[PDB]
Amino acid sequence: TLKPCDYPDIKHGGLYHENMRRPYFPVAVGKYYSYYCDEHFETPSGSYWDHIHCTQDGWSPAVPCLRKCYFPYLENGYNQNHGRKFVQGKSIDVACHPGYALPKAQTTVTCMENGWSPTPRCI
Amino acid sequence: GLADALTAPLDHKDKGLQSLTLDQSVRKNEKLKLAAQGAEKTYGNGDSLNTGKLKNDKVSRFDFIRQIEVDGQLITLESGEFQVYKQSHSALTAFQTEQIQDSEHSGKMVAKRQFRIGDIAGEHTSFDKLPEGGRATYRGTAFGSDDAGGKLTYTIDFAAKQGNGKIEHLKSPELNVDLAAADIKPDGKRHAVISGSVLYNQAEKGSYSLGIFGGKAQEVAGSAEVKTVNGIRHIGLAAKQELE
């Protein structure tokens, strides 16, 4: 018998019912457990919780929790993207009012694991 | 006694379980707003829910809104019904999601129905203070989405330190499963717990976990997560043995 999966270390999240489940690892292929993501991350299901599965090739999804960035209101810019949600890795062309721009000569902002880089502001 | 759990302060002559700590029901920096019967309160990770006011061996229902503070502004992430099942030494919470935040716009809510078990708490029976003998049978309730009519039967053999049981009468046929024989084990704090697999028509269809509660291991409370053709569904579990 094989039990390849050990307690899943979930970045930006965790398992539900840790205390009850932790003593039963390692686990066999096919087992799964409900998990949550921290504030601002979501599961591939669009919820902030889902289930993670033990496979031959490890825990799946491989990346259980991804960052979601809210695009902020732009004081002196065009607000087509105000209130929009963007996923980690997403890049944006900030459209600034005439006479205004991103600081220090930037042109785009990216949703990073820790949030917008750099901060979308206009001036 | 809903509006009352929300506003009344712990009264000490209240039937237990008296107090439930919201840990899995609310994340580090989010707010959970509960409402019912002309009352309303906000929690609070680590915050205490006054269950003393609620009826035993039944499901208490509240309206809920989950929020986060983004730039001095609260944004709704999820809403629906918050369910609470209360026993004497244990209690659990559940969420019936009716709405979640839109995937593309924070400020838009979308219809989505989901059910999950939140907190499982109470007066944990110490592993090291279990009886060494006997077979305690437990009877109680199993509840899933839209169905708090399920019946739970569970049996613990304290000599063999194993447990095994059954779920019946839930409207959803795929939820009426066997809780296979499983080993009692010590917690990280040495609380008696149980985790095993779930069987439906002899096939492995998920897992289940139970805490043991009460000075005399009077009770059991936990959850099952079952694979259906639609597919994975949660079942709240709460049973107690009969006293004298």
**Domain residues of chain A, as ranges?**
1-65, 66-123
Residues B199 and A78: their CA atoms lie apart, in Å, by: 57
CB B183 within 8 A of CB B157: no
At A114, which amino acid appears?
N
Residue of A nearest to B117 (CA): A16
List beta partners, residue B65: B33, B79
Distance from CA of B226 to the nearest CA of A (A): 10
DSSP type of residue B90:
E
Is the domain spanning A1-65 CATH 2.10.70.10? The answer is yes
- Cβ-based neighbour number of residue B169 at 10 Å: 13
Omega before B140 within 30 of 0, i.e. cis:
no
Would you give the distance in Å from CA A95 to the centre of its chain?
Answer: 25
Task: Find the helix or strand (DSSP H, E) in which B165 lies.
Answer: strand B162-168
Q: Flag if A85 and B103 touch (Cβ within 8 Å).
A: yes
Distance from CA of B13 to the nearest CA of A (A): 30
CATH of B1-125, one of 2.40.440.10, 2.60.40.1980, 2.60.120.10, 3.40.50.2300: 2.60.40.1980
Q: Cα-atom radius of gyration of chain A, to the nearest Å? A: 19
Q: Which technique was the structure solved with, according to the deposited record?
A: X-ray
CB-count burial class (<10 Å; 0-12, 13-18, 19+) for B164: middle
Enter the resolution in angstroms: 2.3
Least Cα distance to B120 among B39, B232, B234, B199 occurs for B234
Least Cα distance to B62 among B3, B148, B146, B145 occurs for B3
Q: Flag if B195 and A21 touch (Cβ within 8 Å).
A: yes
Task: Return all residues near B216 (Cβ < 8 A) that are at least 6 apart.
Answer: B131
CB B115 within 8 A of CB B83: no
CB B22 within 8 A of CB B5: no
Task: Find the helix or strand (DSSP H, E) in which B124 lies.
Answer: none
The SS3 of residue B89 is: coil
List beta partners, residue B42: B33
Residues A68 and A66: their CA atoms lie apart, in Å, by: 7
Residues B82 and B60: their CA atoms lie apart, in Å, by: 8
- Chain B residues whose beta carbon lies within 8 Å of the beta carbon of residue A22: 188
Tell me how many degrees the CA angle B14-B17-B22 measures, rounded to the nearest 5.
115
Beta strands B48-50 and B59-69 are unpaired
Residue of A nearest to B183 (CA): A24
CB A121 within 8 A of CB A102: yes
Q: Flag if B70 and A34 touch (Cβ within 8 Å).
A: no
As its CATH architecture, domain A66-123 has Ribbon (2.10)
Beta strands B19-21 and B39-43 are unpaired
CATH no., domain B126-244 = 2.40.160.90
Domain range list for chain B: 1-125, 126-244
To test the contact with chain B by mutation, choose from A32, A33, A34 the residue with the greatest count of B C-beta atoms within 10 A, namely: A34
Residue of A nearest to B114 (CA): A47
Domains A1-65 and A66-123 share a fold: yes
- Cβ-based neighbour number of residue B60 at 10 Å: 19
Greatest alpha-carbon pair distance for chain A in Å reads 68
Task: Return all residues near A17 (Cβ < 8 A) that are at least 6 apart.
Answer: A33, A34, B24, B120, B209, B222, B223
- Cβ-based neighbour number of residue B4 at 10 Å: 15
